[PDB]
Amino acid sequence: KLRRFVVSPYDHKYRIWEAFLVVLVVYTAWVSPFEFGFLRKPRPPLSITDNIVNAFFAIDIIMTFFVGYLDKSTYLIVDDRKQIAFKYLRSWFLLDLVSTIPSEAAMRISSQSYGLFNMLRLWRLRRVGALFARLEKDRNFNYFWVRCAKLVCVTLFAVHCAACFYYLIAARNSNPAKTWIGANVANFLEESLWMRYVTSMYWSITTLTTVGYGDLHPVNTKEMIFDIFYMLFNLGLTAYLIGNMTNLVVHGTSRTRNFRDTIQAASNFAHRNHLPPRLQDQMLAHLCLKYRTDSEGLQQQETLDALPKAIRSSISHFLFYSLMDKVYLFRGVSNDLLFQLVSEMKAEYFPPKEDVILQNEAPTDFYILVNGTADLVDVDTGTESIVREVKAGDIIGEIGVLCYRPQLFTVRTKRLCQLLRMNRTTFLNIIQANVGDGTIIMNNLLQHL
């Protein structure tokens, strides 16, 4: 793993520190543009908060000599100090060093640079792009609310960034009475710093959303030229938003458009072939139940069945071995016979009051219940003489399949059940290959008494 006293790329405290470094980077996205357009020299409320953020980013850049990294040509986790150090000093060392310099110290170098110096603090905005790539290749995060939250952040950052540039064009003017803001409120240089920001954001949003009331428009030619490039940029930006919002609606209404496309087919099918008014309802019940059952991960065979037979045999073994072992028939049969008996066994669901086995039928299959219940009703001259009821983890149809005689009792569900089905041919094959069938028939005649 690692040397004494050192740090790793996936370690928890490192991901937690890094998420707090992303909230600090979202606070310098708001503050860096605002100190460039709206302020000239460090004022108290931010002169200390930005130094706090600077100390935190200095702590981070000095902790990056003690952090692992991962090659994309070897994929080995390189954790040797004299090598991560050089890869840090490769590209992002002094770029991340200028991005944390106390601006009060850049003032003594020169005035006129405060707003422009703290504008390269937007270099520490690569972290948001990193986080947004990681969250959207990750699969624990909904791709809808991870991509749709990136188009909210770059739209709120263009609106905010253009609102501080367009105000700085007006604040740096001479005779601030023919400006965009100095034309509506003449005395705008003595106003609450929150009113200036509100009326700049207002213009930005009207223009970005193409409402364009008409109050707050360009007045000079310097502002017209800015506005020509902002509306060019906005036109391109909104086209791409509308594109991304269709890529997230047609891929969002698939699993419902595929269902009414099935109940429709199941009605044309029953219409062509003239099914009596007893099979169409059964078909529709089993197709519905399928949507609820496979809306969850309880049922999936469209793609889970495209796996190999050595993968789908580990899954169906892990899910049902504990169940298959607790059946009276296969008491002490073997170690592998149970494995291949549970390997080729197809699980199915059944709606309530849906008899899986009719009396006097031809004994094709036998089922093993997994969950739910049912009752062994028999049809006689006096019908509806319900005798017993099975539970989860029991086997039905066994006497007509191991002796080849018509089924004697009809089992009818009374709850959404899940059974395991095995044909007569398959079972007879896999047990005909072996010797342990003596134990099976002995358990059978033991059950009979």
Partner 1 sequence: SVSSSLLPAFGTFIEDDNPSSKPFIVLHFDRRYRLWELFLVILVGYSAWASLFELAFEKAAEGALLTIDLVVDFFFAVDIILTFFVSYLDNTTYLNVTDHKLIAKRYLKSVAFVMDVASTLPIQFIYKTITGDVGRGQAFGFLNLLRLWRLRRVAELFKRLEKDAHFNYFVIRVIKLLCVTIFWIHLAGCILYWIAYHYPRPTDTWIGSQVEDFKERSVWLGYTYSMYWSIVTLTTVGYGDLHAVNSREKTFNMFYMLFNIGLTSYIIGIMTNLVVHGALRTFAMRSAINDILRYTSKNRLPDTMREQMLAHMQLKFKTAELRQEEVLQDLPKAIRSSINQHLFRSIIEEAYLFKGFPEGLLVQLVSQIQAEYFPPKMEIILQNEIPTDFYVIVSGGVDIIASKGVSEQVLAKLGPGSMAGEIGVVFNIPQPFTVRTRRLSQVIRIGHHKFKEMVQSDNDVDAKMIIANFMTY
Ligand X SMILES: CCCCCCCC/C=C\CCCCCCCC(=O)O[C@@H](COC(=O)CCCCCCCCCCCCCCC)COP(=O)([O-])OCC[N+](C)(C)C
Residue positions forming the annotated binding site for a nucleoside 3',5'-cyclic phosphate: 329-449
Per rule CB under 8 A, count of chain residues that contact partner 1: 119
Report the residue number, 83 or 314, with the smaller CB distance to partner 1.
314
Distance in angstroms (rounded) separating the CA atoms of residues 344 and 332: 20
Residues 286-315 that bind ligand X (CB under 6 A): none
Could you tell me how many residues make up the chain? 449
Sign of the dihedral through C-alpha 44, 45, 46, 52: positive
Q: Which does 242 bind (CB under 5 to 8 A by kind): ligand X, partner 1, K ion, none?
A: partner 1
DSSP string, 348-393: EEE-TT--SB-TT----EEEEEEES-EEEEE--SS--EE---B-SS
**420, amino acid identity:** L
Indicate which single residue of 44, 45, 236, 332 sits in contact with ligand X (rule: CB under 6 A).
236
Indicate which single residue of 129, 212, 243, 438 sits in contact with K ion (rule: CB under 5 A).
212
Chain mean position to CA 419: 31
At closest approach, how far in Å is the CB of 334 from partner 1? 9
Distance in angstroms (rounded) separating the CA atoms of residues 43 and 193: 12
Distance in angstroms (rounded) separating the CA atoms of residues 14 and 8: 7
Residue 240 interacting with a second copy (CB under 8 A): no
At closest approach, how far in Å is the CB of 267 from a second copy? 24
Report the residue number, 204 or 407, with the smaller CB distance to K ion.
204
Return the range that interacts with partner 1 (CB under 8 A); candidates 11-19, 41-49, 126-134, 351-359. Answer: 351-359
Distance in angstroms (rounded) separating the CA atoms of residues 54 and 267: 68
**252, amino acid identity:** G
**Would you call 135 exposed, middle or buried from its count of C-beta atoms within 10 A (0-12, 13-18, 19+)?**
middle
Residue 150 interacting with ligand X (CB under 6 A): yes
Residue 179 interacting with partner 1 (CB under 8 A): no
Indicate which single residue of 430, 437, 439, 444 sits in contact with partner 1 (rule: CB under 8 A).
430
At closest approach, how far in Å is the CB of 252 from K ion? 27
Contact 77, 70 (CB under 8 A): yes
Return the range that interacts with partner 1 (CB under 8 A); candidates 30-38, 66-74, 89-97, 298-306. Answer: 298-306
Residue 431 interacting with ligand X (CB under 6 A): no
Neighbours of 66 (CB within 10 A): 16
At closest approach, how far in Å is the CB of 260 from partner 1? 5
Per-residue binding letters, 88-117, with partner 1 (x by CB under 8 A): ------------------------------
Indicate which single residue of 112, 174, 187, 214 sits in contact with a second copy (rule: CB under 8 A).
214
Report the residue number, 244 or 429, with the smaller CB distance to ligand X.
244
Report the residue number, 51 or 364, with the smaller CB distance to partner 1.
364
Residue 374 β-bridge partners: 390, 413
Residue 247 interacting with a second copy (CB under 8 A): no
At closest approach, how far in Å is the CB of 60 from partner 1? 32
Q: Can you tell me which residue has the tokens 């469209």?
A: 302
**14, amino acid identity:** Y
Structure tokens at 138: 């990750």
Q: 377 φ, ψ to 5°? A: -85, 140
DSSP alpha helix (H) spans, 326-392: 337-343
Q: 124 φ, ψ to 5°? A: -80, 50
Structure tokens at 267: 């009605």
Neighbours of 412 (CB within 10 A): 19
Residues 234-273 that bind partner 1 (CB under 8 A): 234-235, 238-251, 253, 256-257, 259-260, 262-269, 272-273
Residues 6+ apart with CB under 8 A from 362: 406
Indicate which single residue of 27, 213, 339, 404 sits in contact with a second copy (rule: CB under 8 A).
213
Indicate which single residue of 210, 264, 314, 385 sits in contact with a second copy (rule: CB under 8 A).
210
Residues 6+ apart with CB under 8 A from 440: 329, 330, 333, 402, 431
Indicate which single residue of 210, 282, 300, 360 sits in contact with K ion (rule: CB under 5 A).
210
At closest approach, how far in Å is the CB of 217 from a second copy? 11
Residues near a second copy (CB under 8 A): 210, 212-214
Residues near K ion (CB under 5 A): 210, 212, 214
